[PDB]
Amino acid sequence: KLKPEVVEELTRKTYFTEKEVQQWYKGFIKDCPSGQLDAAGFQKIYKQFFPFGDPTKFATFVFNVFDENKDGRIEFSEFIQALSVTSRGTLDEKLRWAFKLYDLDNDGYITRNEMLDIVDAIYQMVGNTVELPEEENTPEKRVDRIFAMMDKNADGKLTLQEFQEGSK
Amino acid sequence: KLKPEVVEELTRKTYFTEKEVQQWYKGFIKDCPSGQLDAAGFQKIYKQFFPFGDPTKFATFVFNVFDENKDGRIEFSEFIQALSVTSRGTLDEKLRWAFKLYDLDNDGYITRNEMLDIVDAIYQMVGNTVELPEEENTPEKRVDRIFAMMDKNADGKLTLQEFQEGSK
Ligand SMILES: CCOc1nc2cccc(C(=O)OCc3oc(=O)oc3C)c2n1Cc1ccc(-c2ccccc2-c2noc(=O)[nH]2)cc1
Ligand SMILES: CCOc1nc2cccc(C(=O)OCc3oc(=O)oc3C)c2n1Cc1ccc(-c2ccccc2-c2noc(=O)[nH]2)cc1
Ligand SMILES: [Ca+2]
Ligand SMILES: [Ca+2]
Ligand SMILES: [Ca+2]
Ligand SMILES: [Ca+2]
Ligand SMILES: [Ca+2]
Ligand SMILES: [Ca+2]
Description:
- 2 copies of one chain form a homodimer.
- Chain A has helices spanning 4-13, 18-30, 39-49, 56-66, 76-88, 91-102, 112-126, 139-150, 160-166; strands spanning 110-111, 157-158.
- Chain A is an all-alpha fold.
- Chain A folds into 2 domains: 6-90, EF-hand (Recoverin, domain 1, Orthogonal Bundle), CATH 1.10.238; 91-167, EF-hand (Recoverin, domain 1, Orthogonal Bundle), CATH 1.10.238.10.
- In chain A, helix 3 (39-49) crosses helix 4 (56-66) and helix 4 crosses helix 7.
- The longest helix of chain A is centred in the C-terminal third of the chain and has 15 residues, at 112-126.
- Strand 2 of chain A pairs antiparallel with strand 1 of chain B, so a sheet runs across the interface.
- The structure holds the ligand CCOc1nc2cccc(C(=O)OCc3oc(=O)oc3C)c2n1Cc1ccc(-c2ccccc2-c2noc(=O)[nH]2)cc1 (2 copies) and calcium ion (CA) (6 copies).
- Chains A, B: It is found in: Golgi apparatus; Postsynaptic density; Cytoplasm, Perinuclear region; Cytoplasm.
């Protein structure tokens, strides 16, 4: 369990109610009994959500942001804060969190290569399971959308009139 | 050369002037000395424009439309008429020509498979040389467009302010 002074300060510094902080601390200790989470465990957790990808790179980048004090461990105070900002923060706070994710070397700037590395990390993890933007208009999907819209009577055939009217 | 009665009727039945009909007849005989064009030559011509693709399927489908009387040859009267409609016809005429291309078995209807076959024929011919719709928003292009738009001072780096303002 969590001391009452700790629950009061954490509730104060985050967007969660006291009950929700205590429910998050339970889940933290359940899937992290030592009370401390290192990069290896972070990666293994992301591997449960994405078994068919390589979550190494992206998990490492996200671990960099969770680890506020950059000591190699994620204590609960860092765990809850990241969740509070990423899930219930203002747009400016979420964007600051995102800037930090994209700023891999933590020098205060995002380079083209850093941004490319993030997208490559995301693709390595989810590329082969989630629908991607470049797959929205593949040739077969284009044909299916045109033909469905032109086939007004849905008989599976296109008359010239359907083809002409549908072409406009 | 072309008889004056032939040039008068062809000019009448097409959108070309007499001089243009005679210039098209010259080009026809130059790249088709026998005065008759069969499927093999049609395919070989399309192969000159697309050496790295397989223009067989698409050339065959287009030859089907050129060959109005479906006798296996493209005479000049068919050659000039196809060009006149495809290049200078009304929208309704161009669409009728296109419907005929897409109607592979010439039964008056376009099925899903017929439309898919046309797109597959086009891809076999130009797929590996022309830019495709599904390639417009690939991950690298998305990154380049976001980063270029967010990098206002074009120094190659993104400050938090640039990232925030550009995110909106
Ligand atoms: C919908 C409910 O889950 C969420 N709500 C979120 C709100 C915002 C962000 C994230 C998110 O993705 O943060 C990044 C992230 O991703 C990832 O996989 O791990 C982490 C840390 C959220 N997650 C997903 C999540 C996954 C795992 C844990 C976790 C990690 C270590 C130890 C215990 C737990 C745990 N404690 O209680 C549990 O149920 N597990 C926590 C949260
Ligand atoms: C910009 C100038 O070319 C065009 N203007 C067009 C207007 C509308 C459509 C087409 C088009 O693509 O028709 C389908 C098509 O495609 C293809 O490759 O062959 C064909 C027949 C056009 N073409 C391209 C073209 C290519 C080859 C020939 C051709 C074929 C056989 C014998 C002689 C010639 C010839 N006679 O004079 C020449 O210069 N060549 C004719 C035209
Ligand atoms: Ca830490
Ligand atoms: Ca950086
Ligand atoms: Ca129909
Ligand atoms: Ca013919
Ligand atoms: Ca048909
Ligand atoms: Ca800049």
